[PDB]
Amino acid sequence: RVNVEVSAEDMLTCCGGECGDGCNGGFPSGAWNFWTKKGLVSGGLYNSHVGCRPYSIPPCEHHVNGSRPPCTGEGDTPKCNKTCEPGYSPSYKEDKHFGCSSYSVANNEKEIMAEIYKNGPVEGAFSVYSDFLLYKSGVYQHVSGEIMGGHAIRILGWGVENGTPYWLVGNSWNTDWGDNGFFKILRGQDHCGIESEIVAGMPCT
């Protein structure tokens, strides 16, 4: 009944203090909470003209060389505008999709696998070190580099590569970064805290 591109714009601009601080970072569980309290409208990629509120921040080169301009490390949080783009129907208020639950999954590899297996992809977070930026393929394992900060991502599966167990992960740095926008990271030993902040939730049917 619904295959919708949920708006990142709506979450980023209208959640407020409960999710943290817009373009200056925030809280994953806070975001799932917003989905259950205020809901989220549809919204596609930068100028796709898809949905109620498409993303308004242009795509850029994330730690790689490409044809788009280079990213400039966080800019300003855009306004919380409660209207859909021109030509879209229905209105903002009626294009809202609500979640019916928001919860945290324990730091336990098996419980995280069960959650993904039964209910779908989850959101997690990990400490990004300098060596991760150049990731291309294989299973990532932090070797060296200075701490750059925390990073929230989508975990959508797992596997074993060359005997090394990993989590299949979708980054949000476009497709010219890493393995077509995805990467694998060591699973089983809370590597860079990948298993420590898993959050998820269920849609209102």
Partner: protein, 48 residues
């Protein structure tokens, strides 16, 4: 639980699972991880 598992292959009727977005020049990683998984989930649990 199976040794391997790829959500893209398991729910082929849900294209968002394969999609990669671009957060642009903004620390909105927290919002993206959420909306992306929420999109996958709305599709996976399409009522009942």
């Amino acid at each position: 639980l199976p040794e391997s598992f790829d959500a893209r292959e398991q729910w082929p009727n849900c294209p968002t699972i394969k999609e990669i977005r671009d957060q642009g020049s903004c620390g909105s990683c927290w919002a993206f991880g959420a909306v992306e998984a929420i999109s996958d989930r709305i599709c996976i649990h399409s009522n009942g």
